Amino acid sequence: GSHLWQMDNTHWNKTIIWVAVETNSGLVEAQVIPEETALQVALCILQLIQRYTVLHLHSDNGPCFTAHRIENLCKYLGITKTTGIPYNPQSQGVVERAHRDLKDRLAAYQGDCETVEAALSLALVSLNKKRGGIGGHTPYEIYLESEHTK
């Protein structure tokens, strides 16, 4: 309903992974990146804004999240940007669980794929489309619904 996404960079072995979670639906988006830079982060945001509706972006004070590059990019994309985790108690809950669940799926799929990127895709499909909550609604269905009402 608010389309607020929180992003963070994480590590899975040597691979760095940018991760964004939509707070309302719990929908997860992630992408493997070459290195933790503002340039890569900007590419990730452009991809996110390309595929989904992003009205507000939150993250920690990390350098790659506070560069003028990122600040101006969000202004250009008309995205409200904030810093300093957390945002609100309930959101932090959703985000923490998602990172954990993502890491669990990653541990499962890595042995089934040649690449980490293919393992990440399957891990995201699993989190977003292969589990239900209340009403049997997948995080994907919930997000889609919030999109539809808007």
Sign of torsion over alpha carbons 4, 35, 47, 148: negative
What 3-state DSSP class applies to 8?
A: strand
Rounded to 5°, the CA angle 74-78-81 comes to 45
Six token digits for residue 138: 């997948």
* Total number of residues shown for the chain: 150
- On whether the CB atoms of residues 104 and 4 are closer than 8 A, the answer is no
Split into its structural domains, the chain has a count of 1
Cβ atoms < 10 Å from Cβ of 120: 23
CB neighbour list of residue 62: distance below 8 Å, 6 or more residues apart:
9, 36
Domain extent, residue 30, equals 1-150
We report the CATH number of the domain holding residue 16 as 3.30.420.10
Element (H, E) at 22: strand 15-22
Measured between alpha carbons, how far is 103 from 106 in angstroms, rounded to an integer? Answer: 5
Can you give the resolution of this entry in Å?
A: 2.2
Rounded-to-10 torsion of CA 32, 131, 133, 19: 0
CB 66 within 8 A of CB 37: no
HEC string of 58-90?
EECCCHHHHCHHHHHHHHHCCCEEEECCCCCHH
Cα-based torsion angle of the residue sequence 84, 2, 105, 109 in order, rounded to the nearest 10 degrees: -110
> For residues 61 and 68, what is the distance between their CA atoms, to the nearest angstrom?
13
